[PDB]
Amino acid sequence: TLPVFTLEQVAEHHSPDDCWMAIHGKVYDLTPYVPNHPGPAGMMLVWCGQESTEAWETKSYGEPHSSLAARLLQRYLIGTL
């Protein structure tokens, strides 16, 4: 069954070399994905350790992530919030 985390635990993984996020009530360990993120360098890094649903939904300027990107995000799932 999926592990359950709190936002406080997610916040301990807040750096480029140890980056977890909470998106839509789910927790993801995105550390391996960090260097592969497309777009302007370092946009995902500001959200390591955070609840990041709005940034996920809008890319911070008003475009959603694609269905392809949503499949890629799900691979890094580690639990629920």
Which residues carry a binding-site annotation for heme? 37, 65
Is residue 3 within 8 A of residue 26, CB to CB? The reply is no
Compute the distance between CA of residue 49 and CA of residue 22 in angstroms, rounded to an integer. Answer: 8
- Interacting residues with ligand HEM (CB under 6 A): 21, 30, 33, 37-40, 43-44, 47, 52, 55-56, 59-60, 63, 65-66, 68-69, 72-73, 76
Q: Tokens 């008003």 sit at which residue?
A: 62
Choose between 27 and 30: whose C-beta lies nearer to ligand HEM: 30
Token pair listed for 54: 């709005």
Compute the distance between CA of residue 55 and CA of residue 69 in angstroms, rounded to an integer. Answer: 13
Measured from each CB, the residue nearest to ligand HEM is 39
Minimum distance of ligand HEM from residue 13's CB (angstroms): 13
| Partner residues linked to 15 by β-bridges | 18
Choose between 1 and 36: whose C-beta lies nearer to ligand HEM: 36
